[PDB]
Write a protein that holds these residues in place. Sequence first.
Motif, mmCIF file in Angstrom:
data_model
loop_
_atom_site.group_PDB
_atom_site.id
_atom_site.type_symbol
_atom_site.label_atom_id
_atom_site.label_comp_id
_atom_site.label_asym_id
_atom_site.label_seq_id
_atom_site.Cartn_x
_atom_site.Cartn_y
_atom_site.Cartn_z
ATOM 1 N N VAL A 182 0.906 -1.209 -0.025
ATOM 2 C CA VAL A 182 -0.053 0.033 -0.027
ATOM 3 C C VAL A 182 0.846 1.084 0.100
ATOM 4 O O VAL A 182 1.875 1.244 0.638
ATOM 5 C CB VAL A 182 -1.139 0.096 1.198
ATOM 6 N N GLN A 183 0.384 2.183 -0.559
ATOM 7 C CA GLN A 183 0.942 3.613 -0.723
ATOM 8 C C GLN A 183 0.968 4.261 0.702
ATOM 9 O O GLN A 183 -0.166 4.062 1.508
ATOM 10 C CB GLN A 183 0.026 4.619 -1.662
ATOM 11 N N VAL A 184 2.080 4.726 1.228
ATOM 12 C CA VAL A 184 2.162 5.462 2.424
ATOM 13 C C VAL A 184 2.371 6.812 2.510
ATOM 14 O O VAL A 184 3.390 7.171 1.643
ATOM 15 C CB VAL A 184 3.176 4.543 3.404
ATOM 16 N N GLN A 216 8.393 2.922 3.541
ATOM 17 C CA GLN A 216 7.966 2.067 2.365
ATOM 18 C C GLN A 216 6.836 1.275 2.435
ATOM 19 O O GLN A 216 6.708 0.773 3.681
ATOM 20 C CB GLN A 216 9.198 1.207 1.999
ATOM 21 N N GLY A 217 5.860 1.341 1.768
ATOM 22 C CA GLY A 217 4.541 0.715 2.025
ATOM 23 C C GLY A 217 4.494 -0.467 0.869
ATOM 24 O O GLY A 217 3.880 -1.533 1.012
ATOM 25 N N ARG A 218 4.867 -0.204 -0.491
ATOM 26 C CA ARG A 218 4.315 -0.949 -1.471
ATOM 27 C C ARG A 218 5.470 -2.128 -1.792
ATOM 28 O O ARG A 218 6.684 -2.000 -1.435
ATOM 29 C CB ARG A 218 4.149 0.103 -2.740
ATOM 30 N N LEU A 219 5.003 -3.407 -2.181
ATOM 31 C CA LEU A 219 6.041 -4.396 -2.205
ATOM 32 C C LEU A 219 6.362 -4.376 -3.707
ATOM 33 O O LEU A 219 5.290 -4.009 -4.839
ATOM 34 C CB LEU A 219 5.220 -5.552 -2.026
ATOM 35 N N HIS A 220 7.369 -5.004 -4.264
ATOM 36 C CA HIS A 220 7.907 -4.889 -5.764
ATOM 37 C C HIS A 220 8.133 -6.417 -6.327
ATOM 38 O O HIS A 220 7.736 -6.610 -7.447
ATOM 39 C CB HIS A 220 9.044 -4.155 -6.177
ATOM 40 N N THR A 221 8.734 -7.223 -5.631
ATOM 41 C CA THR A 221 9.019 -8.652 -6.105
ATOM 42 C C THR A 221 8.254 -9.613 -5.565
ATOM 43 O O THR A 221 7.438 -9.674 -4.643
ATOM 44 C CB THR A 221 10.589 -8.759 -5.728
ATOM 45 N N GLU A 222 8.444 -10.767 -6.234
ATOM 46 C CA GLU A 222 7.575 -12.072 -5.974
ATOM 47 C C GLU A 222 8.109 -12.375 -4.475
ATOM 48 O O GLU A 222 7.067 -12.816 -3.760
ATOM 49 C CB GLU A 222 8.039 -13.297 -6.895
ATOM 50 N N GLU A 223 9.335 -12.404 -4.034
ATOM 51 C CA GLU A 223 9.671 -12.657 -2.972
ATOM 52 C C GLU A 223 9.080 -11.739 -1.670
ATOM 53 O O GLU A 223 8.740 -12.160 -0.606
ATOM 54 C CB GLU A 223 11.165 -12.184 -2.469
#
Lengths: 50, 50
Positions: free
Chosen positions: B16-18, B41-48
């Motif tokens: 999520v956007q923070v 940082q709220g948003r995720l980027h990778t499969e991991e």
Amino acid sequence: GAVFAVYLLLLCAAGVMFKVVPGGFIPTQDKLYLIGGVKMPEGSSLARTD
Amino acid sequence: GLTASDVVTAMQEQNVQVSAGQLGAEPLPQESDFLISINAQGRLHTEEEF
């Protein structure tokens, strides 16, 4: 023949004119204001800028 | 012990956007010298990370 010789040189001179006369767009003119401002150190508050 | 809807909610909560705000912003009784933006940082980027 002599006038045509001068004409040929004047023509060459015309060519140089387009090379030594600086190109321009709109002459700068007094628009009755100046633009001032400031960059403060990175991280400065608006109060410091003010 | 989980439902589909638990999983969807957890994903919406954790990617999520923070909006993290600032230190030294107005209003203060005495002028601040600095304005410091915060990153979280709220948003995720990778499969991991997902």
